[PDB]
């Protein structure tokens, strides 16, 4: 099982003066860190969010980001000044950074940047570059950001070395939470007819839900989207279009790893 580590940053710029930056960190589908604009420090959302880093190692790492948040805010504001009246507020910047882990000690790091909801910039190798589809005016910010050798070397170290090491540590410290097994609970309902089989409170995400009459699997079964619960579990519903009168005989069978063979069969 491969785990993707994600550092999701969202920055809003309403005008020349007003600005805010909020960050969230995910390991798989579980949140590990929170960093609100109001907060001066990065907050742990798990007891094991520090990973295998020592206190001295974390303070130094947080401080680097603390300076970055202030720096990033000023730099974007100055980059708008370089374009104006080419580009204008409101401006939304999104950053998706981190690394995906693989069997053994293999990994792949990424740093993806979005402008106004569109993916335009990435850090690749030793420099910043635009992706296919990006507008040409971005060549000036790219040339400016690449001139900063100090930022380049720092980002290279964060992606190549720091990310894999930190996640290898997170997987050890968070093994108990990452490998947790929460049992789903199911209930049935009907709407004007369409029958709905609700499944709630399961972890991990993979699940099998299907409407069945005995041993026959119904083809018209439509799975919804995986909806999250507040307690870090998942919710999913399956719908089936049927004629009125033939509701009797239909059952919802649910397979999940937590159940351990004993599938939840629910007749109507």
């Amino acid at each position, epitope marked *: 099982k491969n785990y993707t580590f994600r550092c999701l940053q969202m920055s809003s710029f309403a005008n020349r003066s007003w600005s805010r930056t909020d960050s969230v960190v995910w390991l798989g589908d579980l949140q590990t860190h929170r960093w609100s604009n109001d907060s001066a420090t990065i907050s742990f959302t798990k007891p094991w969010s520090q990973g295998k880093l020592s206190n001295q190692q974390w303070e130094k790492l947080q401080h680097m980001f603390q*300076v970055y948040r202030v720096s990033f805010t000023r*730099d974007i504001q100055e980059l708008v*000044k370089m374009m104006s009246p080419k580009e204008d507020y409101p401006i939304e910047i999104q950053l998706s950074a981190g690394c995906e882990m693989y069997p053994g000690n293999a990994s792949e790091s990424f740093l993806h940047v979005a402008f106004q909801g569109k993916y335009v910039v990435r850090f690749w190798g030793t420099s910043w570059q635009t992706v296919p589809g990006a507008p040409s005016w971005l060549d000036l910010p790219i040339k*400016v950001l690449n*001139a*900063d050798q100090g930022t380049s070397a720092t980002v290279q170290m964060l992606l190549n070395d720091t990310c894999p090491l930190f996640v290898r540590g997170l997987l050890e410290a968070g093994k108990s939470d990452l490998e947790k097994q929460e049992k789903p609970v199911a209930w049935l309902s009907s709407v004007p007819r369409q029958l709905v089989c609700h499944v709630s409170g399961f972890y991990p995400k993979p699940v099998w839900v299907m409407w069945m009459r005995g041993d026959q699997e119904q083809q018209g079964t439509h799975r919804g989207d995986f909806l999250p619960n507040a307690d870090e579990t998942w919710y999913l519903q399956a719908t089936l279009d049927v004629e009125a009168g033939e509701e009797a005989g239909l059952a919802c069978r649910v397979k999940h790893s937590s159940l351990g063979g004993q599938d939840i069969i629910l007749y109507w």
Partner: T-cell receptor
Amino acid sequence: AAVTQSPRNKVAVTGGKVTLSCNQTNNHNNMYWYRQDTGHGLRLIHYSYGAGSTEKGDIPDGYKASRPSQENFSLILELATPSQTSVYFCASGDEGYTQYFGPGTRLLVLE
Amino acid sequence: TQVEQSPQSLVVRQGENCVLQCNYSVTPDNHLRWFKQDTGKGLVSLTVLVDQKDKTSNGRYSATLDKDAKHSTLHITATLLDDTATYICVVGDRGSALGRLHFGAGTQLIVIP
């Protein structure tokens, strides 16, 4: 990379119009205006990232900036005041952090 | 004033060595630059320090930088008359044009011939 300033020395009256010009033939996108006063370091007045663009610095009050072309960057004093008696340094640079400074302009505003 | 220089003024005899201190609170600290300015003249770049623990030299001028202590020294070996000048410390907060230069008030050196 060479930067020039005109005039090099100016004696003006209070209320008069003073225009401090700066020329740069290095094809630098970015130009900067500073003033030097005893007991202080150089302080940013105005700056520019390109033609037709001017940006407020740390102490912009009493000054207006003008950039009609890539090569010229002008600091304008519409209503000159004795408090604007200073040595004015112009600078230029490309994407890099290096700012190449001009020779400086002495200004005295008399009552 | 995030960049402070010591001493304010300095009187030294020809041939003698002198050290010039610079202390800053600029964040972040990309590079530190030492300028030489003659009474009247413009700003002449002597050296630029870039590393966490950096050391540079330019003939009779030599400089160190400690980014952990946020502190720099300018050593002038065997001072000549032409060293009579104001020496200015400058810290840049970026490695690009997005940076702002933070200037010190300067250190006034007088060399007795």
